[PDB]
Design an enzyme around this catalytic site. Structure first.
Site, PDB file in Angstrom:
ATOM      1  N   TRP A  88       0.946  -1.260   0.067  1.00 22.65           N
ATOM      2  CA  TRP A  88       0.019   0.094  -0.072  1.00 22.65           C
ATOM      3  C   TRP A  88       0.936   1.319   0.053  1.00 22.65           C
ATOM      4  O   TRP A  88       1.823   1.302   0.613  1.00 22.65           O
ATOM      5  CB  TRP A  88      -0.983   0.134   1.359  1.00 22.65           C
ATOM      6  CG  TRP A  88      -2.253  -0.848   1.093  1.00 22.65           C
ATOM      7  CD1 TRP A  88      -3.331  -0.282   0.351  1.00 22.65           C
ATOM      8  CD2 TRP A  88      -2.538  -2.097   1.500  1.00 22.65           C
ATOM      9  NE1 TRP A  88      -4.376  -1.261   0.416  1.00 22.65           N
ATOM     10  CE2 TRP A  88      -4.165  -2.326   1.080  1.00 22.65           C
ATOM     11  CE3 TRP A  88      -1.649  -3.067   2.020  1.00 22.65           C
ATOM     12  CZ2 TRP A  88      -4.322  -3.565   1.285  1.00 22.65           C
ATOM     13  CZ3 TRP A  88      -2.338  -4.240   2.142  1.00 22.65           C
ATOM     14  CH2 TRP A  88      -3.634  -4.585   1.678  1.00 22.65           C
ATOM     15  N   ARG A 125      -4.621   6.961  -2.011  1.00 24.81           N
ATOM     16  CA  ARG A 125      -3.079   6.295  -2.348  1.00 24.81           C
ATOM     17  C   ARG A 125      -2.025   7.264  -3.050  1.00 24.81           C
ATOM     18  O   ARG A 125      -2.324   7.517  -4.141  1.00 24.81           O
ATOM     19  CB  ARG A 125      -3.339   4.592  -3.000  1.00 24.81           C
ATOM     20  CG  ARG A 125      -4.255   3.955  -2.359  1.00 24.81           C
ATOM     21  CD  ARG A 125      -4.363   2.471  -2.964  1.00 24.81           C
ATOM     22  NE  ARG A 125      -5.247   1.552  -2.422  1.00 24.81           N
ATOM     23  CZ  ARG A 125      -5.438   0.511  -2.938  1.00 24.81           C
ATOM     24  NH1 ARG A 125      -4.952   0.082  -4.033  1.00 24.81           N
ATOM     25  NH2 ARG A 125      -6.570  -0.341  -2.528  1.00 24.81           N
ATOM     26  N   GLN A 130     -14.302   3.129  -3.656  1.00 25.48           N
ATOM     27  CA  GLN A 130     -14.167   1.626  -3.538  1.00 25.48           C
ATOM     28  C   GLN A 130     -15.680   1.411  -2.957  1.00 25.48           C
ATOM     29  O   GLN A 130     -16.344   2.209  -2.272  1.00 25.48           O
ATOM     30  CB  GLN A 130     -13.090   1.169  -2.646  1.00 25.48           C
ATOM     31  CG  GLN A 130     -11.936   1.114  -3.504  1.00 25.48           C
ATOM     32  CD  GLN A 130     -10.890   0.392  -2.531  1.00 25.48           C
ATOM     33  OE1 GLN A 130      -9.899  -0.437  -3.162  1.00 25.48           O
ATOM     34  NE2 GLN A 130     -10.837   0.661  -1.286  1.00 25.48           N
ATOM     35  N   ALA A 153     -16.234 -10.770   2.429  1.00 26.81           N
ATOM     36  CA  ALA A 153     -16.003  -9.162   2.096  1.00 26.81           C
ATOM     37  C   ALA A 153     -15.444  -9.280   0.841  1.00 26.81           C
ATOM     38  O   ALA A 153     -14.727 -10.111   0.451  1.00 26.81           O
ATOM     39  CB  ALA A 153     -15.208  -8.619   3.360  1.00 26.81           C
ATOM     40  N   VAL A 174      -8.123 -11.670   4.648  1.00 27.10           N
ATOM     41  CA  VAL A 174      -9.109 -13.076   4.378  1.00 27.10           C
ATOM     42  C   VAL A 174      -8.186 -14.191   4.169  1.00 27.10           C
ATOM     43  O   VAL A 174      -7.024 -14.114   3.844  1.00 27.10           O
ATOM     44  CB  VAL A 174     -10.128 -12.847   3.013  1.00 27.10           C
ATOM     45  CG1 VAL A 174     -11.549 -12.093   3.327  1.00 27.10           C
ATOM     46  CG2 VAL A 174      -9.218 -11.928   1.829  1.00 27.10           C
ATOM     47  N   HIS A 226      -7.899   2.335   1.419  1.00 28.62           N
ATOM     48  CA  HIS A 226      -9.319   1.359   1.067  1.00 28.62           C
ATOM     49  C   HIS A 226     -10.422   1.521   2.082  1.00 28.62           C
ATOM     50  O   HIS A 226     -10.240   1.970   3.202  1.00 28.62           O
ATOM     51  CB  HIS A 226      -8.800   0.032   0.994  1.00 28.62           C
ATOM     52  CG  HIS A 226      -8.112  -0.586   2.042  1.00 28.62           C
ATOM     53  ND1 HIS A 226      -7.837  -2.050   2.413  1.00 28.62           N
ATOM     54  CD2 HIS A 226      -7.685  -0.168   3.395  1.00 28.62           C
ATOM     55  CE1 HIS A 226      -7.155  -2.148   3.645  1.00 28.62           C
ATOM     56  NE2 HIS A 226      -7.209  -0.971   4.216  1.00 28.62           N
TER      57      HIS A 226
HETATM   58  N1  YSA Z   1      -4.780   3.799  -7.811  1.00 29.17           N
HETATM   59  C1  YSA Z   1      -6.128   3.431  -8.275  1.00 29.17           C
HETATM   60  N2  YSA Z   1      -6.917   4.366  -8.965  1.00 29.17           N
HETATM   61  C2  YSA Z   1      -8.004   3.487  -9.343  1.00 29.17           C
HETATM   62  N3  YSA Z   1      -8.733   2.496  -8.831  1.00 29.17           N
HETATM   63  C3  YSA Z   1      -7.780   1.735  -7.955  1.00 29.17           C
HETATM   64  C4  YSA Z   1      -6.715   2.013  -7.729  1.00 29.17           C
HETATM   65  N4  YSA Z   1      -5.946   1.312  -6.771  1.00 29.17           N
HETATM   66  C5  YSA Z   1      -6.856   0.383  -6.679  1.00 29.17           C
HETATM   67  N5  YSA Z   1      -7.943   0.302  -7.392  1.00 29.17           N
HETATM   68  C6  YSA Z   1      -9.192  -0.532  -7.477  1.00 29.17           C
HETATM   69  O1  YSA Z   1      -9.409  -0.961  -6.224  1.00 29.17           O
HETATM   70  C7  YSA Z   1      -9.629  -2.494  -6.428  1.00 29.17           C
HETATM   71  C8  YSA Z   1      -9.396  -2.897  -4.997  1.00 29.17           C
HETATM   72  O2  YSA Z   1      -8.232  -2.337  -4.610  1.00 29.17           O
HETATM   73  S1  YSA Z   1      -6.917  -3.206  -4.024  1.00 29.17           S
HETATM   74  O3  YSA Z   1      -5.732  -2.631  -3.405  1.00 29.17           O
HETATM   75  O4  YSA Z   1      -6.467  -4.211  -5.179  1.00 29.17           O
HETATM   76  N6  YSA Z   1      -7.755  -4.305  -3.141  1.00 29.17           N
HETATM   77  C9  YSA Z   1      -7.869  -3.587  -1.732  1.00 29.17           C
HETATM   78  O5  YSA Z   1      -7.556  -2.619  -1.567  1.00 29.17           O
HETATM   79  C10 YSA Z   1      -8.634  -4.352  -0.556  1.00 29.17           C
HETATM   80  N7  YSA Z   1      -9.002  -3.742   0.409  1.00 29.17           N
HETATM   81  C11 YSA Z   1      -9.795  -5.251  -1.469  1.00 29.17           C
HETATM   82  C12 YSA Z   1     -10.397  -6.297  -0.774  1.00 29.17           C
HETATM   83  C13 YSA Z   1      -9.889  -7.837  -0.791  1.00 29.17           C
HETATM   84  C14 YSA Z   1     -10.594  -8.723   0.041  1.00 29.17           C
HETATM   85  C15 YSA Z   1     -11.784  -8.160   1.212  1.00 29.17           C
HETATM   86  O6  YSA Z   1     -12.225  -9.187   1.865  1.00 29.17           O
HETATM   87  C16 YSA Z   1     -12.006  -6.884   1.078  1.00 29.17           C
HETATM   88  C17 YSA Z   1     -11.583  -6.089   0.350  1.00 29.17           C
HETATM   89  C18 YSA Z   1      -9.189  -2.643  -7.697  1.00 29.17           C
HETATM   90  O7  YSA Z   1      -9.765  -4.078  -8.068  1.00 29.17           O
HETATM   91  C19 YSA Z   1      -8.979  -1.642  -8.536  1.00 29.17           C
HETATM   92  O8  YSA Z   1     -10.042  -1.639  -9.651  1.00 29.17           O
END
Ligand code: YSA
Ligand code: YSA
Ligand code: MN
EC number: 6.1.1.20
Lengths: 785, 266, 159, 157
Positions: free
Chosen positions: B65, B120, B134, B230, B177, B94
């Site tokens: 992150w 981020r 999100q 989740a 998870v 997130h």
């Molecule tokens: N910089 C960015 N700009 C735009 N969209 C972005 C982004 N970074 C991520 N995203 C979107 O955010 C989604 C999820 O973000 S992630 O960092 O990959 N995954 C998470 O943050 C976790 N919280 C997801 C999660 C996983 C399991 C769970 O039980 C609940 C939640 C992605 O699939 C993407 O479509």
């Protein structure tokens, strides 16, 4: 149906109380609308025997010598006052339930009336006030307070749905209570019959009308007042006792949902004939009404030689002639099952609704007749000392009910319960069902008295209500819906967003009846309604509206007369009927308009309404324009059709003056469109990031020319790089050509990939001037900065 | 007489931002499955954004992150029960922390969905923003299984792209998870998979962190005998392919010419 | 609900007249029969089923009409909300569950429901229900319900 | 792994938990309905704007800002809307604008705000000259807003 607590308690001895009873019937499926306490009888009212009745010379009154413990005298004008009967004596000092004039001893036509003998109405037990209560002369020891043999009663007013005709009989109700667990006491019809022929015959000429018909024979009758227990019972049930015989027939009817009628043999002649009436055939009924019969009416007739005469309206009301009076010695007891449809028709035909028609219409136990004969005859023998024939005249042979497949497992599945098999079967038996087989799918055949038990599902409802609906658990279903159910709610969602947007824009929603005044087709100059009501609430509501604005206009008028709104912006979405049922959206603007409350300048009228509409369609993302078109209900000067996405969907304009005047209204602006509105899919257009080209120009046009026509020509030739085209000024006068007007236009050009060269700009501004003047318009200004 | 074709009074016509539109459709979709929408704070504590979610410091997980750390005193950050929570302040990376906030404040079973602005520290291109949105989903209760998680996403897909749509789950890692997964939905009109988000069965340690925090607060434990799933998906990513927006950077551009194009879209 | 039977006599119907009126069926077909104003939203229960396949859950609000006297709690023109859930394994417990949810959602956690048997040619079991209004301290009789009748399903497939 | 849907009666304290969210959402919709155009702006703030817009300085700053113009967390919503007005004016030349934005603001505590902006000639007949605009136009829309929301509304100097 009225349910006298103690009467029902005779079949269901363990009833806890009228309150719990009500509770019990609710669970069984019987709602009680109300509960009453009914026979409050003061102490001053005692039983009295009429030793003698003397007429008072020159009057229509009688001096009654009563034995009420001590001998007392009383004056009465009641036609039925006669010696040999018991009466309700109100001793002086008594407070009668409804006369507030404490009964006293008073002198009447020469005699001292020591209190007075009562009528049903005076005692407070019934509405009848035309005669005295007639008790059996020996009902009680003279002078004993009537209370002692006539205690108060609690009566429940029960709703008995059409599916439970067996519940129109107190015994039917008791059986249901029995299913819950209560002990059931069925009356024993103790009979001492004699084997002799019946002095009359039975001829069932129309079996379709009388599928099962029986006649009982009772003679040696000693007609007299009924016992106190029975008069109290009938009165509590809303009926009025007449005498021994008649009373029994009513008592049994109420007991087991089986109407029955006693005919004095004096009038039967050689026999009873069940048949249709001959056209015009007359019949004076018991209500004393002379009636004319229809060849469709089923009748209980008698015949003598070659003559045939009607004795009563089969299943509806008995003939006035054949009533049982005191000199009656023998009767023919009718106990049958009539064709529900026929009874229904007939009852309607003569505007009658009797305890009998009501039951025969809802249906009667196809095999309860003979058992009912025994009960009534048994009672006649006990109260009128009747001698009864052993045989009955019987016609028609009803088949017993068939078996119904029943799976205790399916019951629990359909209900979502888990009642053990044994309990299910035990319950069905308590309700009188026969249960055969060892399972899993049993053979259940219902009691002939339950007409509502034909399907397995009916049977499971039985288990659930006896088990109690509250024993059914709570659950939520889970499943992936079948494919063709997806997106099925878009239409609904669409209309709903519309309303909300409208309410958001500033419009106030209004709901108006779908009905229309047939005369308004004229007042509002509309084609007449295509759908009318055969049974309108009133003539002003005899048709189905073809438009929505008429209604809105009327609510404006109405609102103006009640309150004096200075203005109004309304809208309504609703169904309209014409050729096909369709959904419309109409709106109305009225009043001074918008501006500074304290200031004077204001925006309003036509262009205000169109203002809101343009905003509406912009918010809806749809093309919108109004072209001039004539409309009967609109002002010839201010009237146009509405185009959404280039298609005609309705109109906009001011209410025709003449109409406003006939309705006494100031000017009113309105519009009505057809829904659902056109659909235009989002086509995202990445906006150019380069500077746009600005150029102004005016177009001199003859006054008659519509702005929309110009606007269109300018845009057309304006080229493929025209970003915006706006009208910022309209003027007509000097130095313009008499009868001409100019239109100030703000133009904008833009190229998605790069800035536009003045070549491209001016070149287009030219192509415009070309087709512009080539049309017939002048180009006042050009390339204006 | 009047020229009815003439322009009417120029009343203003509004509209909603595309993110708002997309968020609304997503919330509508999950509401039909029994989910309730709740929001959390943008400025969050390291405890909720990380520690509670099983992401400890100085470990590869944290390094995944790109966090924006904050500074300043006098700032009051309230906890799930209005308590004053401590810890290093930061912008939530997130919506997942709202998963712990809700659980300490409520008792299972339940179904929530939580849209939200996340941040981020990373380079912004056509599909990446430093500030985006999100939608978390959380369903906790006795007998909850991964089949239910798959069922949920299957419904999302059907609702979003019609009956010829389908979902695809592949294993992926998330300290919060186990099993963990990433998922994509089949977009029939566009003929290609869209990677929407991450998901899985809520981690045992997350449930432990929740009840442990509940105890500090004096509440009885509530997540000992339950399971749950989740997920977290990108709103902009879905809006882009749904409204045909080519560059994620348009969203926060404020350009009326861009925004006004969605006046129609509901 | 066939003609000339006690069941019909329960409803106060507004009959219509006029030709040239086209009434389309569930699948846009031209349906025939005596026209009338719907006395309830229930017919939409048959229209939907012929046009779709189970399992499903619909809810259908609508304007209904009845020829009766209008007092403070009775109108000749009012609105109803039908609910219909069809599918394998659907039970009365699900019906009770639904209404329980309505109540909770409408009056909070201290709310409750009550079902009592009642009659409707279109269900079996049949029921009428009330919800406990905690703030007002009294039961409210909301509507009728039950397990869709076997003959209704038969009428649907037959059509 | 098969597909399935869960079924359960949610625990009591989960009821009505979505009123707050629903409330704010109706607000936005009403606003969009009234005539306002929604705008989303970064939560970041230019520390220098506390001066330019005469506001108390930001209480929260970033230890790792994307840039110095984004080194703080906005304390208001209008500054941002004003800047988007300027920006819009330089790119395209809108003759007017009625905007609104709902978003989080940070100061002492994180809170949700609603801000709006009116700019331009105002409302009236495009071709005519008379127009309603400025202060009393904005207040006009606000009065309509709170009436549509069923709330008392007054402005004191
Ligand atoms: N910089 C960015 N700009 C735009 N969209 C972005 C982004 N970074 C991520 N995203 C979107 O955010 C989604 C999820 O973000 S992630 O960092 O990959 N995954 C998470 O943050 C976790 N919280 C997801 C999660 C996983 C399991 C769970 O039980 C609940 C939640 C992605 O699939 C993407 O479509
Ligand atoms: N005249 C009237 N004015 C206002 N409201 C009225 C009305 N007549 C009835 N209602 C309302 O309408 C509700 C239901 O109407 S009803 O005639 O009693 N029942 C019906 O019409 C059936 N269709 C109900 C039904 C029963 C079972 C089902 O599976 C589906 C529906 C009532 O509970 C009452 O609140
Ligand atoms: Mn039944």
């Amino acid at each position: 149906m009225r349910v006298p607590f103690s009467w029902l308690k005779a079949y269901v001895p363990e009833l806890e109380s009228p309150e719990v009873l009500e509770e019990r019937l609710a669970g069984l499926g019987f709602e009680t609308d109300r509960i009453e306490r009914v026979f409050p009888i003061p102490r001053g009212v005692v039983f009295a025997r009429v030793l003698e009745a003397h007429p008072i010379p020159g009057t229509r009154l009688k001096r009654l010598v009563l034995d009420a413990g001590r001998t007392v005298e009383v004056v009465s004008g009641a036609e039925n006052a006669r010696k040999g009967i018991g009466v309700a004596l109100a001793l002086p000092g008594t407070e009668l339930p409804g006369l507030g004039q404490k009964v006293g001893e008073r002198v009447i036509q020469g005699v001292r009336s020591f209190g007075m003998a009562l009528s049903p109405r005076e005692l407070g037990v019934g509405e009848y006030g035309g005669g005295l209560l007639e008790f059996p002369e020996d009902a009680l020891p003279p002078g004993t307070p009537l209370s002692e043999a006539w205690p108060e009663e609690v009566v429940l007013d029960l709703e008995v749905t059409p599916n439970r005709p067996d519940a129109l009989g107190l015994l039917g109700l008791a059986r249901d209570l029995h299913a819950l667990g209560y002990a059931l006491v069925e009356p024993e019809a103790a009979l001492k019959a004699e084997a002799l022929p019946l002095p009359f015959a039975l001829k069932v000429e129309d079996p379709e009308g009388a599928p099962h018909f029986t006649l009982g024979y009772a003679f040696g009758l000693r007609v007299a007042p009924s016992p106190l227990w029975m008069q109290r019972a009938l009165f509590a049930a809303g009926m009025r006792p007449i005498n021994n015989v008649v009373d029994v027939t009513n008592y049994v009817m109420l007991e087991r949902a089986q109407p029955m009628h006693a005919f004095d043999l004096r009038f039967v002649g050689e026999g009873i004939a069940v048949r249709r009436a001959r056209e015009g055939e007359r019949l004076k009924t018991l209500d004393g009404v002379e009636r004319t019969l229809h060849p469709e009416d089923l009748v209980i007739a008698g015949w003598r030689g070659e003559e045939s005469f009607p004795l009563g309206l089969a299943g509806v009301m008995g003939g006035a002639e054949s009533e049982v009076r005191e000199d009656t010695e023998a009767i023919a007891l009718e106990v049958a099952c009539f064709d529900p449809v026929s009874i229904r028709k007939t009852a309607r035909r003569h505007g009658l609704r009797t305890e009998a028609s009501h039951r025969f219409e809802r249906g009667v136990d196809p095999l309860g007749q003979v058992p009912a004969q025994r009960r009534a005859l048994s009672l006649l023998q006990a109260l009128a000392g009747a001698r009864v024939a052993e045989a009955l005249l019987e016609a028609g042979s009803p088949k017993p009910p068939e078996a119904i497949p029943f799976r205790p497992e399916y019951a629990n599945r359909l209900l979502g319960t888990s009642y053990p098999e044994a309990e299910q079967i035990a319950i069905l038996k308590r309700l009188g069902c026969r249960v055969e087989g060892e399972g899993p799918t049993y053979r259940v055949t219902p009691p002939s008295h339950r007409l509502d038990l034909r399907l397995e599902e009916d049977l499971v409802e039985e288990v659930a209500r006896i088990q109690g609906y509250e024993t059914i658990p709570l659950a939520l279903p889970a499943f992936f819906p079948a494919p063709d159910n997806r997106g099925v709610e878009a239409p609904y969602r669409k209309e709903q967003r519309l309303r909300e947007v409208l309410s958001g824009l500033g419009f106030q929603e209004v709901y108006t009846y779908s009905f229309m005044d047939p005369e308004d087709a004229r007042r509002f100059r509309l084609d007449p309604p295509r759908l009318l009501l055969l049974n309108p609430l009133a003539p002003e509501k005899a048709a189905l509206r073809t438009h929505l604005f008429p209604g809105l206009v009327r609510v404006l008028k109405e609102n103006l007369d009640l309150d004096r709104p200075e203005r109004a912006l309304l809208f309504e979405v609703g169904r309209v009927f014409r050729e096909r049922e369709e959904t419309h959206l109409a709106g109305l603007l009225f009043g001074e308009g918008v501006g500074l409350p304290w200031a004077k300048e204001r925006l309003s009228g036509y262009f205000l309404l169109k203002g809101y509409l343009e905003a509406l369609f912009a918010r809806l993302g749809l093309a919108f324009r109004v072209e001039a078109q004539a409309f009967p209900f609109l002002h010839p000067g201010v009237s146009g059709r509405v185009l959404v996405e280039g298609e005609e969907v309705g109109f906009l304009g001011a209410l025709h003056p003449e109409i406003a005047q006939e309705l006494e209204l100031p000017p009113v602006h309105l519009f009505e469109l057809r829904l659902p509105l056109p659909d235009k899919p989002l086509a995202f257009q990445d906006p150019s990031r380069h500077p746009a080209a600005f150029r102004d120009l005016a177009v001199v046009v003859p006054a008659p020319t519509p702005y929309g026509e110009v606007e269109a020509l300018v845009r057309e030739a304006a080229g493929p790089y025209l970003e915006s085209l706006a009208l910022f000024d309209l003027y007509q006068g000097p130095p313009l050509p008499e009868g001409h007007k100019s239109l100030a236009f703000h133009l904008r050009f833009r190229h998605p990939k790069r800035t536009l060269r003045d070549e491209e700009v001016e070149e287009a501004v030219s192509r415009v001037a070309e087709a512009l003047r080539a049309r017939g318009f002048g180009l006042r200004g050009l390339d204006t900065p | 007489r009047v020229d009815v074709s003439l322009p009417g009074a120029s009343l203003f016509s509004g509209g909603l931002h595309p993110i708002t539109l997309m968020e609304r459709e997503l919330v509508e979709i999950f509401r039909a499955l029994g989910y309730q929408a709740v929001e959390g704070p943008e400025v969050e504590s390291e405890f909720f954004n990380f520690d509670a979610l099983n992401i400890p410091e100085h470990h590869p997980a944290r390094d995944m992150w790109d966090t924006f750390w904050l500074t300043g005193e006098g700032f009051r950050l309230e906890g799930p029960l209005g308590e004053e929570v401590e810890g290093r302040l930061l912008l939530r990376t997130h919506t997942s922390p709202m998963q712990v906030r809700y659980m300490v404040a409520h008792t299972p079973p339940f179904r929530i969905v939580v849209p939200g602005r996340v941040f981020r520290f990373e380079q912004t291109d056509a599909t990446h923003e430093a500030v985006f949105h999100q939608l978390e989903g959380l369903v906790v209760g006795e007998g909850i299984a991964m089949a239910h998680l798959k069922g949920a996403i299957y419904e999302l897909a059907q609702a979003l792209f019609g009956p010829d749509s389908k979902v695809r789950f592949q294993p992926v890692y998330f300290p919060f998870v186990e099993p963990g997964a990433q998922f994509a939905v089949w977009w029939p009109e566009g003929g290609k998979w869209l990677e929407l988000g991450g998901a899985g069965m809520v981690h045992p340690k997350v449930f432990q962190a929740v009840d442990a925090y509940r105890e500090r607060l004096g509440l009885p434990p509530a997540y000992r005998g339950v399971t749950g799933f989740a997920f977290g998906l990108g709103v902009e990513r879905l809006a882009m392919l749904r409204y045909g927006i080519p560059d994620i950077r348009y969203f926060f551009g404020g350009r009326l010419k861009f925004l006004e194009q969605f006046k129609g879209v509901l």
